[PDB]
């Protein structure tokens, strides 16, 4: 939206601004790389988020999220982004922490000093950042055979909600 107080959403509002306005498909309608490796990185955040949401929780309980990191590895595999496996164990290849949020909540953390002040709102800023580009997103999971951000999410976050509970 536009106006001098943008609040319910503020940056959640300049960041769903850039979010359309970054055109995620746009750049991988001019970028075949772009394309690909935002397409694989975005479920592979999710993938990351899976590790970090459950490992969040699982540093408490001290449980072991990389058997679970082995499942959302699965959906990083049979999503298509593999490249690293291990002790009986997978890791997608462009797996990081969203890029399509990474510069979204880095335009925010540059625009936004207030909101992005505390160490873990910059952090959680990028949560539901990766939440949104879920709707620019999803159409770069519309050609080959890739999997939504929901429809992918909640499969990894059922290894990430199987991890979560364990009887806690």
Do not use: C, D, R
């Given at each position: 939206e536009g106006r001098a107080v943008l609040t319910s959403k503020t940056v959640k509002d300049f960041m769903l601004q850039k979010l359309n306005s970054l055109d995620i498909k746009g750049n991988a309608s001019k970028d075949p790389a772009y394309a690909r490796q935002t397409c694989e990185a975005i479920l592979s955040a999710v993938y990351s988020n899976n590790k970090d949401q459950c490992c969040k929780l699982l540093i408490s309980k001290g449980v072991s999220i990389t058997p679970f990191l082995k499942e959302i590895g699965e959906a990083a595999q049979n999503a298509g982004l593999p490249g690293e496996i291990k002790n009986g164990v997978f890791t997608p290849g462009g797996a990081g922490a969203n890029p399509f949020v990474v510069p979204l909540i880095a335009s925010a953390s540059i625009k936004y000093?207030?909101?992005?002040?505390?160490?873990?709102?910059?952090?959680?800023?990028?949560?539901?950042?990766?939440?949104?580009?879920?709707?620019?997103?999803?159409?770069?999971?519309?050609?080959?055979?890739?999997?939504?951000?929901?429809?992918?999410?909640?499969?990894?976050?059922?290894?990430?909600?199987?991890?979560?509970?364990?009887?806690?």
């Open positions: 000093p207030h909101m992005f002040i505390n160490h873990n709102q910059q952090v959680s800023f990028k949560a539901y950042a990766e939440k949104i580009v879920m709707k620019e997103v999803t159409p770069l999971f519309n050609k080959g055979t890739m999997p939504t951000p929901q429809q992918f999410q909640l499969t990894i976050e059922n290894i990430a909600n199987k991890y979560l509970q364990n009887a806690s």
